[PDB]
Design a protein around this ligand. Structure first.
Ligand code: EB4
Ligand code: FE
Ligand code: NA
Length: 174
């Protein structure tokens, strides 16, 4: 298994004055880029949603919902606030076989339309990283998508490591 190296954290900006309350709610994964992400023309990635909800202790309950095998899988996890506002770590890391590290960093967002979030996970000693282009609606402007392509490339990812999930109506609505 050969992976493109995770970028130095210096090359990943941080959203200034992060408003955790405003980042709550459903986001659509309109763009996906990473060293473990591949473009598949035979079976193109279907769009999925990720809901963020602040608890009393100000950690997130991050629930992903995707359409797979004719059903709807619910992938739940907790983001604990990290070193800075916008940065998070994965709660209950011990419950994931092999996972020794997990970082999340909100690169940029306007809270009501779009967001770019940088993730980085060390599982089985393999360093994985990804950037998701969150959209409040299923569609986003060409500028925002080209900006996401530009940023992904600045972290060493080529074109075939950047996919744009196709919009669907199954389960990501509601
Ligand atoms: O590129 C990343 N993974 C690869 C796979 O590589 C990994 O990092 C492994 N897995 C975790 O380490 C992980 C442990 C505990 C919690 C995790 O979220 C883990 O990812 C393998 O399993 C998976 O995560 C599987 N995928 C989901 O379950 C998923 C489905 C929908 C939505 C998802 O978010 C999913 O993870 C297989 O596909 C992947 O997405 C990747 C990198 C950096 C940060 C990531 O979060 C990545 O996911
Ligand atoms: Fe993941
Ligand atoms: Na993924």
């Amino acid at each position: 298994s050969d992976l493109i190296p995770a970028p130095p954290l210096s090359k990943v900006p941080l959203q200034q004055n992060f408003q955790d309350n405003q980042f709550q709610g459903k986001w659509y994964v309109v763009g996906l880029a990473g060293n473990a992400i591949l473009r598949e023309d035979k079976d193109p990635q279907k769009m999925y949603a990720t809901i963020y909800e602040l608890k009393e202790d100000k950690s997130y309950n991050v629930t992903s919902v995707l359409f797979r095998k004719k059903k709807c899988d619910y992938w739940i996890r907790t983001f604990v606030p990290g070193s800075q506002p916008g940065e998070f770590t994965l709660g209950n890391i011990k419950s994931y076989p092999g996972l020794t590290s997990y970082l999340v960093r909100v690169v940029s967002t306007n809270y009501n339309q779009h967001a770019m979030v940088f993730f980085k996970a060390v599982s089985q000693n393999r360093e994985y990283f990804k950037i998701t282009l969150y959209g409040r609606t299923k569609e986003l402007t060409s500028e925002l998508k080209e900006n996401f392509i530009r940023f992904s490339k600045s972290l060493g990812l080529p074109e075939n490591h950047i996919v744009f999930p196709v919009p669907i109506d199954q389960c990501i609505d509601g």
